[PDB]
Amino acid sequence: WTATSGSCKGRCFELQEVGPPDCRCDNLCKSYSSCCHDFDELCLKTARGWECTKDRCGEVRNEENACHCSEDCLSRGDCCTNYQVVCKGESHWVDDDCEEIKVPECPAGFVRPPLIIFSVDGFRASYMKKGSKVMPNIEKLRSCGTHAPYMRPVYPTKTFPNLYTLATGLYPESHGIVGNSMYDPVFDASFHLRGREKFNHRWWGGQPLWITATKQGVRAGTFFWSVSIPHERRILTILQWLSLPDNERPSVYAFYSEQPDFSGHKYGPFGPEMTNPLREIDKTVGQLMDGLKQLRLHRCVNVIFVGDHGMEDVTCDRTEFLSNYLTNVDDITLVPGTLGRIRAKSINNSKYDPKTIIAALTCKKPDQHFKPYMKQHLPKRLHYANNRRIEDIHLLVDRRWHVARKPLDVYKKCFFQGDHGFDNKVNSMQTVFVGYGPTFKYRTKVPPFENIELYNVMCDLLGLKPAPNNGTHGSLNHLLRTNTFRPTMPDEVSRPNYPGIMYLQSEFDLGCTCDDKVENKLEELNKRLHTKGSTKERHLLYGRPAVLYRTSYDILYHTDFESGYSEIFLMPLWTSYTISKQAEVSSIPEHLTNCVRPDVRVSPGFSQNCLAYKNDKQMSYGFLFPPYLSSSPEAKYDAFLVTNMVPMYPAFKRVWAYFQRVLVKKYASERNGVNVISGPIFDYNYDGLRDTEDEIKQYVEGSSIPVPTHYYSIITSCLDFTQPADKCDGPLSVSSFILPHRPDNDESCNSSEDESKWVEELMKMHTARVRDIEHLTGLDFYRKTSRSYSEILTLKTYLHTYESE
Ligand SMILES: *[C@@H]1O[C@H](CO)[C@@H](O[C@@H]2O[C@H](CO)[C@@H](O[C@@H]3O[C@H](CO[C@H]4O[C@H](CO)[C@@H](O)[C@H](O[C@H]5O[C@H](CO)[C@@H](O)[C@H](O)[C@@H]5O[C@H]5O[C@H](CO)[C@@H](O)[C@H](O)[C@@H]5O)[C@@H]4O)[C@@H](O)[C@H](O[C@H]4O[C@H](CO)[C@@H](O)[C@H](O)[C@@H]4O[C@H]4O[C@H](CO)[C@@H](O)[C@H](O)[C@@H]4O)[C@@H]3O)[C@H](O)[C@H]2NC(C)=O)[C@H](O)[C@H]1NC(C)=O
Ligand SMILES: Cc1nnn(Cc2cc(C(F)(F)F)ccc2CCC(=O)N2CCC(Sc3ccc(C(=O)O)cc3F)CC2)n1
Ligand SMILES: [Ca+2]
Ligand SMILES: [Ca+2]
């Protein structure tokens, strides 16, 4: 029910939403069918349009008009945005030269610079270059403000997940808006772009910026806008709220445009029809900036121009149909389109088998334009698993394609030429960021960054303490002139032990063998020194990583590598080594093929054993420091220590061996040395966070040796590649990966070929940020460098994407 016979007289666009059955006058009343009878008449005036003309200047106030050109309009806060231009000889904001805003220049009574978020739907990153001739206001904001060449959205690259990520700083898996369409099974219920289910608060987790603001006594504009409210009226509403008395005026506001997405879907991203929607958005920006300048707020407000995602060319004819792969196509439900999510059609079906569905979708057609995944096997960089609303089965769809269940779904639903939702590293999905105002920097380009980082920055902009989120606070401090948060390194929780030689060979019964009985004072002191850490400055270039949880571990030094060896997990948490440009690759000699050697620094009781590997018919082993990159035949014996061994499926060993034998050396050649930190990851509950011991679901048969879910490496060099990795005076360059530790290579359809035709492609897919690895390991890297901590935080969020320009 609604008693819609109350009135909006004096309540147009009211900020506190009033409860049923009392009728509403706020910017969402239309979307609830709850607006008072007179809302349109009073609050949605349109008479005489949106611009002052010469003839209207000085006019007698007529309250019927949509906006005013009368002499009392500035004081009333309701002039047309162009009033001062037409009626007082002023210039449009866009026509003014840009002048640095060194301090906020605000009217009396302003406690802080307001923040206005100008959000645009489907605003692809390259529009900034390609549409620049038709977007003069946007292009001024961009060149005079702070801007990134692009901003990375979250996956899926859809509207609802990305807007709510912008608002909360959280991955969709955490905030719960995991798609524009979703089914939740604990509610039992379905969320869609249509209908009322999307209004229940129970879908929406986390704490969005407007709630953060309100909880800490910073008043917020209502961010959402009903679709029928035109853009000119949204802008005039924001400008009116900005004229409220000090005690009633919000400090944070949002505008939202449905364009250019709406047109992009119809015409493709660069369709000739796209020029006008870009013109119109720029005009609206101009309205806002002119309106701010009238209110003397244009050198006071911080403005963010931000997109949710980009837009790709997609047409009906590029659709893959599941009914071409499965027999049982009516036993499933598919969430279709630029991603696929599959679940059973019924939970009273015991005859449902995810394994058979995956196998039927795997490498079945030679050009196949999607790949299936169990959600826990998706690239960890997507962070797209830890929610009951994300189906176990996922299809990652090739850019430019769709997936559907049956042909009937595509003709009983060609309409469209653009779409989005693909992998968030795809160039066409990238979107935009510009920050302009006193708190942002002046004429400053910043590197591309992820949208999950902006919540922290918006909180900094408003003097708010951010709710717990997935940004790395400090990583975007380089966007800001002032208001920077001062981050600090997390304290180390566990200090390492530094064991010496404590055990005789015969104390071990590990079932291991090595042909190493081969016998000098010169070289005897020297190797003692290597075991005590004399080469450590070379192999540990950025300090040892800090362990941020309570555990028992040892530092082990060697000629060619250093490691942090966990007595709980029976393997290194990390292994660090430097490979110069000049370093040589060698083979594992024949006599040392199955060599594994007890480590006399580490008790038999805290060691792995070879017998378990022998008995485990599925599980083999590999090494963290590669025997192939030993500095000398003598140092090579160190690589076969039981403390350098890790469990590896034979299928995975093909990937690992190629990485260690070929790719490390290539990277060292190309980057003028690299430092590598490699290690295991355990994420059996796929929450993106380090597992505790008691969460491990798989051990090497008959042992306490836990099986990693993944293996990482972080590969660091000098950004200035004329300087070698081990003598770099300036900023660093990093690429990292998190490889799934899988007993098959079904993910790689070309895996029957030589590793040179597929391994590197796989690794690229599983590119990661350092920060991802930190969450997964409880380690903190880059503790000892010459660089500022904010710069290091930026480095740790970097993702190497492998896309062209
Ligand atoms: C990205 O950033 C986010 C935010 O920082 C990180 O997510 C956090 O991770 C924490 C650890 O996983 C997690 O902490 C747990 O919180 C439990 C209480 O949570 C409620 O309250 C908070 C605060 O207001 C709220 O945010 C939560 O919101 C979630 O759940 C609602 C629905 O209830 C959703 O609407 C919402 O979207 C959100 O869902 C997401 O998180 C939940 C889990 O919280 C997932 O299941 C969802 O899939 C979804 O992703 C909650 O409303 C608290 O009970 C936990 O405490 C247990 O563990 C501790 C460990 O020390 C132990 O002391 C206790 O024994 C306790 O265990 C007891 O309960 C167990 C479970 O029933 C039981 O097994 C035991 O036997 C015991 O009885 C824990 O502290 C935190 O809530 C989330 N926050 C969010 C917002 O997601 C995320 O990790 C970051 N990601 C990366 C990759 O870094
Ligand atoms: C989605 C989403 N998540 N967060 N936002 C707000 C947002 C955040 C940001 C920022 F700063 F973060 F970048 C910028 C702009 C907005 C407004 C989005 C908007 O006016 N829109 C038009 C209505 C549609 S439909 C709809 C209506 C009501 C509700 C509700 O109250 O539950 C939910 C709904 F999905 C939604 C989009 N939108
Ligand atoms: Ca969108
Ligand atoms: Ca985990």
Ligand code: NA
């Ligand atoms: Na084995």
Ligand code: NA
């Ligand atoms: Na394969």
Ligand SMILES: [Zn+2]
């Ligand atoms: Zn769209």
